Scaffold this active site. Structure first.
Site, short mmCIF file in Angstrom:
data_model
loop_
_atom_site.label_atom_id
_atom_site.label_comp_id
_atom_site.label_asym_id
_atom_site.label_seq_id
_atom_site.Cartn_x
_atom_site.Cartn_y
_atom_site.Cartn_z
N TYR A 1 -30.47 -63.58 6.69
CA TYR A 1 -29.80 -62.92 7.81
C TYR A 1 -30.91 -62.09 8.46
CZ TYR A 1 -26.21 -60.34 10.43
OH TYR A 1 -25.42 -59.76 11.40
N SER B 1 -25.05 -66.18 12.93
CA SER B 1 -25.09 -65.02 13.83
C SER B 1 -26.54 -64.56 14.00
CB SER B 1 -24.22 -63.89 13.26
OG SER B 1 -23.76 -63.01 14.27
N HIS C 1 -15.94 -66.38 15.51
CA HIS C 1 -17.21 -66.08 14.87
C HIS C 1 -17.23 -66.43 13.38
CE1 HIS C 1 -21.20 -64.51 15.15
NE2 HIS C 1 -21.00 -63.58 14.23
#
Length: 684
Positions: free
Chosen positions: A452, A532, A651
């Site tokens: 991430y 994301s 999402h």
């Protein structure tokens, strides 16, 4: 394979006078018939490609069968009932059950009966003080927008008309009169892509129309903020209002409700630090903050004069990141030790009671409750250990097994080892590698490297049925705790923001190099994945090092770094990314790694499967659309550049189990197929 024809427009943007072409600008219009036709054509090509993979159905059946087991959450008491979530196995959404002494448990709220496809999910749950009324928020098709519904708790009858235009909101009751919530005015244009930057707190009084709700905060110029929240303390004495413009840093105000028309006092008037209320004891406020504390600390201050100059340390900052939970009259300090949890119990005077022994190395959930709860519950899990619930009696410190997992996975069959590899600048970065015992380091294991890297998010060990299945198929799963994250505090976070963002990408590249050098895998057996901000991670690494991996899996990623701030609440990420409007230096830096602007004609990219969803209003799908379009036009190699657009999903939060299973099956089948497997490596 033949990609749908993607028209190239004449749009040209300018940044400080410098021109930048954007041929797929039209895909930003989510409501045009042209964009909708493109999505349909792309999905058809993707499904046609996936249909040729012989073992995709087997992977899907393996996943579904292993996912099919009873699951149950920790109970919570309110009114004459104890409430708890359950899923008998494959229910799309977890069901809320309840039970009162002397009677059998009963279904109270079943989200699966609220939509035809299980795409309506239950988010916030908030009971009135007398426990007779329930306010809950629902998400439709997975978007960030919400509707707050009211229900009579005893009869289960719906009350009033649902409140709309709710977003990024909690639900906090003032006794039994009504509740505070946050909302953005319905934007003109597409609610799924239009910019929203003025969040407001409203109070809904029971028995009235939403149009008559009192505006509490955020309307007047001096109070304009992108994110706002309001919460009434457990004892009803105080109202706390947080206000922010970005995902890091916030102002905090407090109002004494016991004092008729009391003023809004400032707990913190600037945005230079994060500060949140853990609880309060009388007029004493307990605040968790990183103000003058990179790894955070717990301080106290009297509500009558709450400014930072008066904050006093209760739990001083340490070398490990702190998070605080409260329950049963105690404070629980959860510390992060190399991404794994440790828990210490403190009284409200800051005196250590004991360290709470955990079942092992992983993540914990719980330790949260009301001052009066006779017992607390906590869950423990890691990559090889399915969620297990434990009962904890705070006073004696007695820990007991409340509920063992019913999962068909045996922890003892897996290895989950932590290593610290060296990044380009020498920084040691944590990496947790999991796989089935019996693995040989001959460089041939199909591997998925996940990361991430940003927004102070810490990737602590978590159990995933999909991941366990990847391991059972013979794969290796490695999770890197890249800088930009919050594993080692604010300093770890800041080393990956704005003009230091490249550090995050260098950290990920070094993780891939470590896995190959140590013999876990090799270039043609390596896949990278992220969602994301993690999607940005994959897009950047694949455009910078298309030779590093065999498969790239960017999910709901931020891929157009030059225009990301122009959609929905994207500007709230400026603290982490900076914007193209900040300066020529920031513009050049962003353009320098922006995935969309770094795809080049004639380059041979790895097999890629871009994934997004039509209702993702957190990160608009246009990011993925334009990126996929560019890859299909520029890629010169033989590897497929596909995009899979999930329908009636957002999402990620609240996605029904059926869709999660389909997505994983498609992703794992694509990955193995692109790695050249004619048959599954192991018996499914």
């Amino acid at each position: 394979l033949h990609y749908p024809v993607t028209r190239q427009g004449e749009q040209v943007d300018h940044y400080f006078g410098q021109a930048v072409a954007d041929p797929y600008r039209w895909l930003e219009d989510d409501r045009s018939p042209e964009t909708e036709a493109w999505v349909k054509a792309q999905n058809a090509v993707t499904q046609d490609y996936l249909a040729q993979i012989p073992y995709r159905a087997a992977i899907k059946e393996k996943l579904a069968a292993s996912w099919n087991y009873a699951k149950e959450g920790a109970p919570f008491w309110w009114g004459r009932y104890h409430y708890f979530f359950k899923n008998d196995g494959l229910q799309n959404q977890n069901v809320l059950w309840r039970q009162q002494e002397g009677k059998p448990a009963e279904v109270f709220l079943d989200p699966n009966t609220l939509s035809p496809d299980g795409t309506t999910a239950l988010d916030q749950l908030s009971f009135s003080r007398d426990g007779r009324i329930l306010a809950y928020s629902l998400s439709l098709a997975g978007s960030d927008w919400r509707e707050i519904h009211l229900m009579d708790v005893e009869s289960k009858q719906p009350l009033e008309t649902p409140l709309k235009d709710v977003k990024f909101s909690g639900i906090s009751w003032l006794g039994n009169e009504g509740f505070f919530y946050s909302s953005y005015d319905k934007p003109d244009g597409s609610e799924l892509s239009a910019r929203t930057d003025q969040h407001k707190v409203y109070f809904h009084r029971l028995g009235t129309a939403q149009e008559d709700d009192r505006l509490v905060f955020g309307a007047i110029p001096a109070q304009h903020h992108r994110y706002v929240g309001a919460t009434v303390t457990e004892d009803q004495r105080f109202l706390l209002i947080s206000a922010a413009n970005s995902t890091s840093g916030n102002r905090l105000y407090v109002k004494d409700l016991s004092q008729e028309n009391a003023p809004l006092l400032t707990v913190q008037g600037d945005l230079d630090a994060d500060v949140s209320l853990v609880d309060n004891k009388g007029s004493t406020l307990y605040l968790l903050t990183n103000r003058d504390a990179p790894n955070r600390r717990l301080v106290t201050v009297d509500a009558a004069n709450p400014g930072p100059a008066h904050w006093r340390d209760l739990i001083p900052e340490r070398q490990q990141v702190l998070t605080v939970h409260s329950g049963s009259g105690y404070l629980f300090a959860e510390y992060m030790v190399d991404a794994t949890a440790r828990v210490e119990q403190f009284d409200y005077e800051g005196k250590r009671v004991r360290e709470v022994a955990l079942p092992g190395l992983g993540s914990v959930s719980g330790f949260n409750g009301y001052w009066w709860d006779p017992a607390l519950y906590f869950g423990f899990e890691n990559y090889a250990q399915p969620p297990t619930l434990y009962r904890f009696e705070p006073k004696s410190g007695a820990i007991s097994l409340y509920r063992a997992s019913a999962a068909p996975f045996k922890p003892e069959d897996y290895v989950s080892e932590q290593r610290f590899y060296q990044s380009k600048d020498g920084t040691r970065v944590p990496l947790i590698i999991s796989y089935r015992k019996g693995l040989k380091l001959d460089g041939s294991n199909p591997t998925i490297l996940y990361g991430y890297g940003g927004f102070d998010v810490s990737l602590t060990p978590s159990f995933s049925v999909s991941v366990a299945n990847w391991l059972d198929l013979g794969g290796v799963y490695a999770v890197a705790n890249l800088r930009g994250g919050g594993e080692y505090g604010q300093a770890w976070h800041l080393a990956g923001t704005q003009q230091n963002k490249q550090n995050v990408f260098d950290d990920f590249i070094a993780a891939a190099e470590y896995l190959k050098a140590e013999g876990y895998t090799r270039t043609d057996r390596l896949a990278i994945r992220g969602g994301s901000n993690g999607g940005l991670l994959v897009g950047a690494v694949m455009t910078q090092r298309p030779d590093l991996m065999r498969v790239a899996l960017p999910a709901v990623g931020v891929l157009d770094m030059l225009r990301y701030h122009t959609f929905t609440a994207g500007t709230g990420w400026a603290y982490d990314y900076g914007t193209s409007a900040d300066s020529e230096a920031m513009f050049d830096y962003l353009k320098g790694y922006s995935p969309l602007h770094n795809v080049r004609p004639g380059v041979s990219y790895p097999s890629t499967m871009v994934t997004t969803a039509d209702h993702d209003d957190r990160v608009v799908p246009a990011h993925s659309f334009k990126f996929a379009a560019t890859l299909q036009a520029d890629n010169a190699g033989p590897h497929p550049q596909l995009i899979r657009i999930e329908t009636n999903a957002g999402h990620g939060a609240g996605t029904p189990v059926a869709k999660l299973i389909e997505q994983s099956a498609d992703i794992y089948a694509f990955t193995l197929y692109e790695m050249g497997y004619r048959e599954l490596p192991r018996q499914p």
